[PDB]
Design a protein around this ligand. Structure first.
Ligand SMILES: *[C@@H]1O[C@H](CO)[C@@H](O)[C@H](O)[C@H]1NC(C)=O
Ligand SMILES: *[C@@H]1O[C@H](CO)[C@@H](O)[C@H](O)[C@H]1NC(C)=O
Ligand SMILES: *[C@@H]1O[C@H](CO)[C@@H](O)[C@H](O)[C@H]1NC(C)=O
Ligand SMILES: *[C@@H]1O[C@H](CO)[C@@H](O)[C@H](O)[C@H]1NC(C)=O
Ligand SMILES: *[C@@H]1O[C@H](CO)[C@@H](O)[C@H](O)[C@H]1NC(C)=O
Ligand SMILES: *[C@@H]1O[C@H](CO)[C@@H](O)[C@H](O)[C@H]1NC(C)=O
Ligand SMILES: *[C@@H]1O[C@H](CO)[C@@H](O)[C@H](O)[C@H]1NC(C)=O
Ligand SMILES: *[C@@H]1O[C@H](CO)[C@@H](O)[C@H](O)[C@H]1NC(C)=O
Ligand SMILES: *[C@@H]1O[C@H](CO)[C@@H](O)[C@H](O)[C@H]1NC(C)=O
Ligand SMILES: *[C@@H]1O[C@H](CO)[C@@H](O)[C@H](O)[C@H]1NC(C)=O
Ligand SMILES: *[C@@H]1O[C@H](CO)[C@@H](O)[C@H](O)[C@H]1NC(C)=O
Ligand SMILES: *[C@@H]1O[C@H](CO)[C@@H](O)[C@H](O)[C@H]1NC(C)=O
Ligand SMILES: *[C@@H]1O[C@H](CO)[C@@H](O)[C@H](O)[C@H]1NC(C)=O
Ligand SMILES: *[C@@H]1O[C@H](CO)[C@@H](O)[C@H](O)[C@H]1NC(C)=O
Lengths: 207, 418, 411, 148, 50, 49
């Protein structure tokens, strides 16, 4: 199954405050009106980066696995979130698609339908970034036509090679970032309020 | 494929003339830019700013920063000159009487409102529709908008109370209806055509000023000629300031980061790439501002000529002071420019008549002294050519020249001898 | 001095830029106190083979780079995009220390934008490298009896390495039609060894290499030089340095609504408008100290040696004294009369030398007049005056021409 | 009195004095004097020092020519205005307000000046006005009369 | 250099070896073997028109 | 008679011919041909030329 992303997946592109200005930026962004996949499970490719979103009510989704092999020979990144802690760990893990049946030469460790949770995963320069947003919505969870920007959670210097990922278990959406130029509307009190995807159509290229 | 206009076969023949039965007073609007914003750039503060290291390298290029700052200073001082050439033409600050007995013509929309700058109602419509650390500075004009409004007020008060006379010497008073009768007489329409139609002519003028007020309140798109002078200067400055962020092949575009990261022998090699590119960036801007200032000077010299010839006078130059035969025009100020409200006579309801070059009386050819011979079916009359008023053909309305035999198209008719 | 003459005609002349100078100087570095673990690299037991170079990430420490660059031990210490003398004043988001051994001739290949066997098959630096390459002879350590074969390089590959690409693969290379087959004629095992012997000639002797790669982003620092922080000063004009962001300005308390991840702010022209103090959750607005043009207002020097000074756009509280809208005007007396404009100052103000001293006044547009208008009054000239008025127009310039080859190259 | 003609002389002098002074600038070479560089250095290094002088001197001369092209168009506008004044004002009698001096124009006379022209504009200016009552028309035997 | 050389009446003080003018030009020189002051002038030049 | 119109046509043709002929100039580089510089020289040297 598939869905229209509308204008979802915009994020704050740098750690710089701006107000009452239009900023034009090139980065890995989810293209406007892009064709996102929908799911109940499987391992998926990661490409240049992932936009991910889910139905925040039943709280069944708890984390992710990222890597190449997902089972030995080389490291994989594991993320798990529960009521007391977010935990992030990097190891030569040998689990199947359910490390929570338990839970390996570890090299890094770190600790910290009514609602829509949105995430961006990106692996470039200073390696793995996470951005997110959590907001209330009307009961049809079909990626609403409004606008909001994802804010950085963490920025991890881990140096890992990622080509595939999988969810740890509700329904969820997946889309892929692309090298794209955006014009961002920072309105007042630091806040991004609108954007133009400059390559979407000739009118956006004119704007 | 664009349309050039509607086609019109004119009904020409060797003996037909069309003469207008009636007229419309037309009030056309013309907008002209006169001056720019007086922006000036410090070449050393733009290229370097704070840095002694960059400043000492910029001295190796010699006169260029004095030559650029001299050029922008010449453009800035000329904007005050352009504004003096247009508005400061009146010798004395004339004032209208407190009693508005102008023969039915109503100037309330173009004279000052003293309750307010003390601008007119139309000057406030015109002022509403138009809208620091990189070495850039914006200087104020010499005349404030309140001083420009005092000049347009004095020019307008002189025009209404004294005709063209205030442009030729001391203002000599004349009643406004008698001034309008001489502006009619100056376009070849006889004085009685005003005095016999004075309430119609006054109502057509008052109505046409109401259409200007409504049009200027309705849309900003008319003042695009002034707004483009703001937009061209803004795009030039936005480009000049963006060019500070360019590397030009230096390790960074931030002069303090070069100075914080490198020792002199390496820093001076990186800084000279920024000096070279920033100097070329400023030389390009001053060159295009010198060429743009010459275009605004030409428009200020045109506006100064339109004020002498259209406002202080009555131009006979076709389409110089609006379409139709020029009666008079009125100056209204606008930000960075001037607006002329051109009052013109437009003939409105033509009728066809049979016509002849001369008439035969007692074997001699009579020609019209002023006007045209026209025939109303069976009868012959003489008229002024710009408004139908059929006079009887008489020995006073006509002059003789020789026998009937020479003229092509002459007609046999009686001449009355009073 | 500005006009390059001993005589000045009546006028208003630009002569200088006025500036407030900084009254104090500040350094503002983060709360960190432990020395960076450089000794774990420069005094390591051995480094890897150059085809398999070893990277350590350095963070969250003070880096006294003088401990490195003062030492006579280093047979090479080159820097790119920075000077080694300057590193103790800088701050970096991360530092990556890369380590390996190569022969003394091949050290030339460890530089930005090179091509060659080591540069393109073993360790490639980027074109816009910021960092330092540090190397020393290691024949006393890495060379051994009968030769040391623990040190290797890749001699053959399908394609050249990208900057900081790493490739430890042992797979057979193919130089012709011959398939690799785990072996042959025009097919090769791609890895080779120096065999370092203590008797080798100095170009074939081993050199230890450490490359330090520095990154400075729109981000916090985590490695800083040992330069001590100092007390913050506000509302004065100050010279400052927050995490290596050197500048000058008035620092104010400010109410910019920074989100928790935003480390500094930018104006509409990308100038840095505000910063977060690296020792407090305090947001400081950076405003430039007062500056602007200075214009000197003078009668002719043939008339008086008095002058008045206009500080353009400047406010008189922050430089007789008079606040025009053109700027603060000093040495000209304000007057309640109005006169024809003599020297034009701007925004309706002019100045003149009168009963004597310099005065400044609102200009007069002309004599006030009321025309005696009535609906039945005319006025007619009883007489006339034949007037002759001179008008002068320029028509031509001097016909200059220049031999551009003789101007530029002087014969 | 002739400040317009003297201003055109002064601008051409300031432009040439600036062009000449820019021969004394280094532009980042080891000397501003082209004969020093060739008396001190061999071709391989002298070509590096000389190309800095070529680059700065060519930019110095392109700046002068561009400003003389812009200044000549301002003189051509004044010469086309002076040519129009001689036709309409000297060879004729102008009816254009302010074109040929203040007052109603009678005639004007050309006199030559260095790099310019002077027009002596002769005009009728009215004087000594007196008031009088006025009327638009007069009633005779019921007929309304207007002045010719 | 290249130029015409002539006598001059330039009043060089005892410490002055050469004179200058604003084109970066040496305008005059003291001869080192016989301390007279020489004017330097460009050899005659100009455009050619056909 | 029509020399004013032909002069305006000739000036625009001469300015374009001059703009295009300036592609053959070296400006101090080893060659005026952009591919030839990249064929002769390695990255850091070619980019300065
Ligand atoms: C693209 O979007 C349309 C409309 O939602 C959908 O039918 C189609 O299957 C999508 N195709 C792919 C390859 O995602
Ligand atoms: C899960 O919850 C337990 C509660 O005791 C806590 O110890 C742990 O840190 C949490 N996170 C993970 C990934 O186990
Ligand atoms: C990451 O691992 C995959 C495994 O198939 C490999 O193809 C790829 O070359 C690796 N990434 C990089 C940047 O080399
Ligand atoms: C931020 O700006 C928006 C503008 O709509 C306003 O609603 C909000 O109250 C502002 N926040 C603060 C802290 O003033
Ligand atoms: C002339 O036009 C006016 C309106 O402009 C109209 O009222 C009047 O009747 C017309 N007169 C004739 C003779 O057509
Ligand atoms: C003049 O015109 C205005 C606007 O229509 C009107 O309010 C005013 O009463 C008029 N004055 C006279 C004396 O008719
Ligand atoms: C004048 O005559 C022509 C030809 O008869 C006719 O087409 C036209 O409509 C007439 N115009 C008027 C105003 O009567
Ligand atoms: C004008 O012509 C009509 C016929 O078209 C005629 O009835 C009338 O009498 C003529 N006018 C005069 C004053 O005779
Ligand atoms: C005009 O009158 C003359 C003399 O009576 C006569 O010869 C001629 O034929 C007449 N022409 C017309 C058109 O009536
Ligand atoms: C920084 O260190 C000082 C003591 O040197 C301490 O009082 C202050 O709370 C620290 N601030 C932060 C943000 O760590
Ligand atoms: C000058 O500064 C003072 C102090 O801030 C202020 O009261 C005054 O209004 C300012 N005046 C102008 C014209 O800037
Ligand atoms: C007109 O003026 C002249 C001087 O210009 C004077 O001699 C003459 O008497 C005046 N005439 C009248 C009627 O005032
Ligand atoms: C004309 O009348 C007015 C008002 O009575 C008066 O001021 C003026 O002096 C009179 N004389 C002249 C020559 O204008
Ligand atoms: C040589 O040079 C000196 C310079 O002072 C001069 O006095 C002398 O006459 C010259 N000739 C000889 C033969 O010394």
């Amino acid at each position: 199954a598939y869905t229209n992303s509308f204008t979802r997946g915009v994020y704050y592109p740098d750690k710089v405050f701006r107000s009452s200005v239009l900023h034009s930026t090139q980065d890995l962004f989810l293209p406007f009106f892009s064709n996102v996949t929908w799911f109940h499970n499987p391992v998926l490719p990661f490409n240049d980066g992932v936009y991910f979103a889910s139905t925040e009510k039943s709280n069944i989704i708890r984390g992710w696995i990222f890597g190449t092999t997902l089972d030995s020979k080389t490291q994989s990144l594991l993320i798990v979130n529960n009521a007391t802690n977010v935990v992030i760990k990097v190891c030569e893990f040998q689990f199947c698609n359910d490390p929570f049946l338990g839970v390996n030469n570890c090299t890094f460790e770190y600790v910290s339908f009514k609602n829509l949770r949105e995430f961006v995963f990106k692996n470039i320069d200073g390696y793995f970034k996470i951005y997110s947003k959590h907001t209330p919505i009307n009961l049809v969870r079909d990626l609403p036509q409004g606008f909001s920007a994802l804010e950085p959670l963490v920025d991890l210097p881990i140096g890992i090679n990622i080509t595939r990922f999988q969810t740890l278990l509700a329904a969820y959406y997946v889309g892929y970032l692309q090298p794209r130029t955006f014009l961002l509307k920072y309105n007042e009190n630091g806040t991004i309020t609108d954007a133009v995807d400059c390559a979407l159509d000739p009118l956006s290229e004119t704007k | 494929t664009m349309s050039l206009g509607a086609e019109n076969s004119v009904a020409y023949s060797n003996n037909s003339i069309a003469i207008p039965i009636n007229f419309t007073i037309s009030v056309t609007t013309e907008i002209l830019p006169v001056s720019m914003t007086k922006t000036s750039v410090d070449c050393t503060m733009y290229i370097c700013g704070d840095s002694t290291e960059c400043s000492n390298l910029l001295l190796q290029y010699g006169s260029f920063c004095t030559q650029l700052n001299r050029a922008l200073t010449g453009i800035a001082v000329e904007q005050d000159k352009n504004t003096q050439e247009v508005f400061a033409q009146v010798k004395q600050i004339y004032k209208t009487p407190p009693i508005k007995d102008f023969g039915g013509f109503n100037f309330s929309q173009i004279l000052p409102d003293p309750s307010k700058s003390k601008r007119s109602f139309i000057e406030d419509l015109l002022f509403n529709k138009v809208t620091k650390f990189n070495g850039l500075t914006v200087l104020p004009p010499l005349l404030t908008d309140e001083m420009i409004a005092q000049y347009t007020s004095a020019l307008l008060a002189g025009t209404i109370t004294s005709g063209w006379t205030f442009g030729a010497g001391a203002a000599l008073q004349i009643p406004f209806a008698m001034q309008m009768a001489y502006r009619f007489n100056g376009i070849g329409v006889t004085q009685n055509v005003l005095y016999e139609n004075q309430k119609l002519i006054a109502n057509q003028f008052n109505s046409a000023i109401g259409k200007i007020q409504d049009s200027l309140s309705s849309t900003a798109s008319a003042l695009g000629k002034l707004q483009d002078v703001v937009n061209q200067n803004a795009q030039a400055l936005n480009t000049l300031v963006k060019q500070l962020s360019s590397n030009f092949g230096a390790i960074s575009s931030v002069l303090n980061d070069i100075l914080a990261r490198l020792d002199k022998v390496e820093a001076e090699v990186q800084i000279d790439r920024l000096i070279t590119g920033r100097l070329q960036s400023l030389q390009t801007y001053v060159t295009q501002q010198l060429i743009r200032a010459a275009e605004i000077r030409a428009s200020a010299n045109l506006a100064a000529t339109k004020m002498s010839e259209c406002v202080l006078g009555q131009s006979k130059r076709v389409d110089f002071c609006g379409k139709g035969y020029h009666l008079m025009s009125f100056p209204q100020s606008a930000p960075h420019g001037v607006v002329f409200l051109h009052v013109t006579y437009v003939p409105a309801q033509e009728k066809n008549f049979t016509t002849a070059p001369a008439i035969c009386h007692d074997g001699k050819a009579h020609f019209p002294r002023e006007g045209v011979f026209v025939s109303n079916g069976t009868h012959w009359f003489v008229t002024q050519r710009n408004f139908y008023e059929p006079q009887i053909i008489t020995t006073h309305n006509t002059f003789v020249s020789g026998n009937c035999d020479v003229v092509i198209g002459i007609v046999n008719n009686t001449v009355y001898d009073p | 001095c500005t006009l390059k003459s001993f005589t000045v005609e009546k006028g208003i002349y630009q002569t200088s830029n006025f500036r407030v100078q900084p009254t104090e100087s500040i350094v503002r570095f983060p709360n960190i106190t432990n020395l960076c673990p450089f000794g774990e690299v420069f005094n390591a037991t051995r480094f890897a083979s150059v085809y398999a170079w070893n990277r350590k990430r350095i963070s969250n420490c003070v880096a006294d780079y003088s401990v490195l660059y003062n030492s006579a031990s280093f047979s090479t210490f080159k820097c790119y995009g920075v000077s080694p003398t300057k590193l103790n004043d800088l701050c970096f988001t991360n530092v990556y220390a890369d380590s390996f051994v190569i022969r003394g001739d091949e050290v030339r290949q460890i530089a930005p934008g090179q091509t060659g066997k080591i540069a393109d098959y073993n360790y490639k630096l980027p074109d816009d490298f910021t960092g330092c390459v540090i190397a020393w002879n290691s024949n006393n350590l890495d060379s051994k009896v009968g030769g040391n074969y623990n040190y290797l390089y890749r001699l053959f590959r399908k394609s050249n390495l990208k900057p900081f690409e790493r490739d430890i693969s042992t797979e057979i290379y193919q130089a012709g039609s011959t398939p690799c087959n785990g072996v042959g004629f025009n097919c090769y095992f791609p890895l080779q060894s120096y065999g370092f012997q203590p008797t080798y000639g100095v170009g074939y002797q081993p050199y230890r290499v450490v490359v330090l790669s520095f990154e400075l982003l729109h981000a916090p620092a985590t490695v800083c030089g040992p330069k001590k922080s100092t007390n913050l000063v506000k509302n004065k004009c100050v010279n400052f340095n927050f995490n290596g962001l050197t500048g000058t300005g008035v620092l104010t308390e400010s109410n910019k609504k920074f989100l928790p991840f935003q480390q500094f702010g930018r104006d509409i022209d990308d100038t840095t408008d505000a910063v977060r103090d690296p020792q407090t959750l305090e947001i400081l607005d950076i405003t430039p100290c007062s500056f602007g043009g200075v214009s000197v207002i003078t009668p002719g020097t043939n008339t008086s040696n008095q002058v008045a000074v206009l500080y353009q756009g400047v406010n008189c509280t922050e430089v007789n004294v008079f606040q025009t809208r053109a700027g603060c005007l000093i040495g000209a007396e304000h007057v309640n009369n109005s006169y024809e404009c003599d020297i034009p100052i701007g925004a309706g103000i002019c100045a003149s030398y009168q009963t004597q001293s310099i005065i400044a006044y609102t200009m007069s547009l002309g004599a006030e007049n009321s025309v005696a208008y009535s609906n039945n009054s005319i006025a007619i000239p009883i007489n006339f005056t034949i007037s002759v008025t001179t008008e002068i127009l320029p028509v031509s310039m001097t016909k200059t021409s220049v031999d551009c080859t003789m101007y530029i190259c002087g014969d």
